[PDB]
């Protein structure tokens, strides 16, 4: 049964997850990609996205992507780098 979106009275996904076109919560491209209804910027962060911080304690890379790798947390990291 739909848990988010227009078919769920406008409910948003917990932990900032993306709501797919069909009303389900997730973080893969099938949820955040084409057709995404809400909280679709889950993987983006930083100055290009209103200064948004990543969920799950992920680092925000210099290019505005959320992750845990050295490339996300090292040189240029914008937030939650350690
Ligand atoms: Ca941390």
């Amino acid at each position: 049964a739909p848990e988010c979106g227009e078919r769920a009275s406008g409910k948003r996904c917990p932990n900032g997850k993306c709501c797919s076109q069909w009303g389900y919560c997730g973080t893969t491209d099938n949820y955040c990609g084409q057709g995404c209804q809400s909280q679709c910027d889950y993987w983006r962060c930083g100055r290009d996205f209103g200064g948004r911080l990543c969920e799950e304690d992920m680092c925000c890379s210099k290019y505005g992507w959320c992750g845990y790798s050295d490339d996300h947390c090292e040189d240029g990291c914008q937030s939650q780098c350690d």
Side-chain angles (χ1 to χ4, degrees):
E3 55 190 357
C4 63
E6 53 181 356
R7 285 305 186 59
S9 302
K11 287 186 177 182
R12 288 194 170 191
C13 295
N15 304 74
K17 290 190 175 186
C18 307
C19 182
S20 72
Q21 174 187 178
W22 304 104
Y24 285 95
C25 300
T27 58
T28 73
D29 295 302
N30 299 313
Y31 297 92
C32 305
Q34 209 283 156
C36 177
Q37 296 187 60
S38 61
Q39 294 179 173
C40 312
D41 289 344
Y42 182 91
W43 295 103
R44 303 311 299 276
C45 55
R47 60 185 181 185
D48 290 348
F49 297 78
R52 172 178 182 282
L53 301 176
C54 301
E55 294 280 356
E56 310 303 311
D57 195 39
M58 288 185 272
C59 304
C60 183
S61 78
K62 60 183 179 181
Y63 289 119
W65 287 89
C66 294
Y68 298 115
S69 81
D70 280 358
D71 196 277
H72 291 93
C73 309
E74 299 315 308
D75 125 87
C77 169
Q78 300 184 60
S79 62
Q80 300 179 170
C81 313
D82 67 8

